[PDB]
Amino acid sequence: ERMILIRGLTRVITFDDQERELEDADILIDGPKIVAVGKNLSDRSVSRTIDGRGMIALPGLINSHQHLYEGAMRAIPQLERVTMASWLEGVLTRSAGWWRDGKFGPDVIREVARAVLLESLLGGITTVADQHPFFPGATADSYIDATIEAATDLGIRFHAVRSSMTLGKSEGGFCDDLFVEPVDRVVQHCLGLIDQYHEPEPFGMVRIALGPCGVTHDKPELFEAFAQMAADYDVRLHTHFYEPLDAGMSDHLYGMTPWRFLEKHGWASDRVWLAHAVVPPREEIPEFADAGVAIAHLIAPDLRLGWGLAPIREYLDAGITVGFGTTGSASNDGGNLLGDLRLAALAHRPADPNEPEKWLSARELLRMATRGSAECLGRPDLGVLEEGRAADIACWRLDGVDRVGVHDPAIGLIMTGLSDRASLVVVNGQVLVENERPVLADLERIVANTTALIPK
């Protein structure tokens, strides 16, 4: 029950209400929470002191959109250069083929999730929201049990987002029977996950969310169902939003825009955060803001699939909450959140070539990846380095040869480096990474183990 001190951090970016940063400053930790943040803190009831000299400290990075099972589908030649239609077809084909061959059961997904989630810690990420849409079995399998087990083993903070594809071919589905479950089955299963796994109190380490694949992949009945369950059980809602093909297929299926659909079926609320949001009509943006929905920027896939640049500046001008994510490793193909910020830093600029003020800055992006994502997930206890918040902390060394000459360390973190490896990482007050190595997890064993279970 004794405390931890991180002394002499070169720089501490807090993302509190003032955007306070501190130099040569400390973080005092008591169990799961941050006791204090400032210069020269007392080491009185302290049982361990850690030298932060030459490090920048940020709140733990929070990846607000993952598909862990896709770590098994990395760098596939046939999928290197495909449009979404071929990509989606190729992923489902593979996951389906592997499953019924017996090579893709929960025990496999568990070890795939273990590796990617460990990669996540190693990249400064302390919270991950995974969206798992793949439930064949006919009793809904224990895939989410499997990812929760991996996360819990490793000590990373975790949001399981129960996903699906309830709208089949005969209903206008571009999906498959195998993966089409009845709404009630999806609803019943979610109820059980909440009762069993959901930790609604401050500093909760596992939380359940409800997440249809999308407005054109799921029955409107599921959206209304989840909207009731979210109010009743006080959990959050998640889905994909304004992918380029959506506004076309939504209108074909419902004669309305995806936003209008969400609004009808109870999802224009502050319990909702939304993935990608690449191509909305501009007139709806002020409606996103009044409704209090959050959005997650996912640059690597939006680029990987040819989709382009989501109007992130417009969301920020509108006062909409923006978070950040990597999406799955079949369209990234990494879980490197930090590296992905450099992508967003650079690729937005050609769209406003003469208005650099519009361009996203390093500090806006880091905010997205911490406090922005915290608010996507409805975690007022995360994403900020201040007393009373969770002791979720990620630190990077600034004294490498690849970062000589850096004038601002926050900007340098995005714009320079041969490596995005974090040095020190603290989740829930537990040191899980030190000297860029896992302190509790066995890295080599995990790598050999997971590698042996990857389907050919």
Least distance CB 65 / Zn ion (angstroms): 6
Q: Judged by CB under 5 A, which stretch of 71-79, 320-328, 346-354, 428-436 contacts Zn ion?
A: 320-328
Least distance CB 240 / Zn ion (angstroms): 6
C-alpha dist (Å) from residue 74 to 157, 222, 443? 24, 31, 19
Least distance CB 277 / Zn ion (angstroms): 12
Q: Which two tokens stand for residue 74?
A: 């990395």
Start-to-end CA distance of the chain, whole Å, equals 47
Q: Judged by CB under 5 A, which stretch of 170-178, 186-194, 321-329, 379-387 contacts Zn ion?
A: 321-329
How many chain residues bind Zn ion (CB under 5 A)? 1
User: 134 or 203, CB closer to Zn ion?
Assistant: 134
In whole angstroms, give the CA distance from residue 193 to residue 179.
19
DSSP E strands: which ranges in 18-122?
Answer: 21-30, 33-38, 46-51, 55-59, 61-66
Number of helices and strands (H, E) in the chain? 15, 17
User: 120 or 327, CB closer to Zn ion?
Assistant: 327
Task: Give the DSSP per-residue string, 309-336.
Answer: ---HHHHHHTT--EEE----TTSS----
In whole angstroms, give the CA distance from residue 364 to residue 205.
26
User: 166 or 327, CB closer to Zn ion?
Assistant: 327
Sign of the alpha-carbon dihedral angle for 415, 416, 422, 423: negative
User: 257 or 327, CB closer to Zn ion?
Assistant: 327
User: 62 or 398, CB closer to Zn ion?
Assistant: 62
Q: Which two tokens stand for residue 314?
A: 């417009």
Least distance CB 238 / Zn ion (angstroms): 10
In whole angstroms, give the CA distance from residue 383 to residue 371.
4
H helices within 123-254, ranges in order?
143-154, 183-197, 220-233, 246-254
Give the footprint of Zn ion on residues 326-345 (CB under 5 A).
Answer: 327
Q: How many CB atoms lie within 10 A of CB 377?
A: 26
Least distance CB 253 / Zn ion (angstroms): 20
User: 60 or 212, CB closer to Zn ion?
Assistant: 212
Q: Which two tokens stand for residue 132?
A: 């798992």
Taking the CA atoms of residue 112, residue 185, residue 159 and residue 243 in that order, the dihedral angle to the nearest 10 degrees is 80
User: 15 or 226, CB closer to Zn ion?
Assistant: 226
Q: Which two tokens stand for residue 304?
A: 């990987």
Q: Judged by CB under 5 A, which stretch of 44-52, 158-166, 325-333, 421-429 contacts Zn ion?
A: 325-333
Least distance CB 325 / Zn ion (angstroms): 8
Q: 217 labelled as ligand-binding?
A: no
Q: Judged by CB under 5 A, which stretch of 251-259, 324-332, 401-409, 446-454 contacts Zn ion?
A: 324-332
Q: Judged by CB under 5 A, which stretch of 134-142, 202-210, 265-273, 323-331 contacts Zn ion?
A: 323-331
Q: 65 labelled as ligand-binding?
A: yes
Pairing between β-strand 125-132 and β-strand 21-30 as defined by DSSP bridges? unpaired
Q: In terms of residues, how long is the chain?
A: 456
Q: Judged by CB under 5 A, which stretch of 6-14, 231-239, 319-327, 428-436 contacts Zn ion?
A: 319-327
Least distance CB 163 / Zn ion (angstroms): 9
Nearest residue to the partner Zn ion, using Cβ: 327
User: 214 or 220, CB closer to Zn ion?
Assistant: 214
Least distance CB 242 / Zn ion (angstroms): 13
Q: 67 labelled as ligand-binding?
A: yes
Residue numbers in the known binding site are 65, 67, 240
Residue numbers in the known binding site for Zn(2+) are 65, 67, 240
The binding site for Zn ion (CB under 5 A) comprises: 327
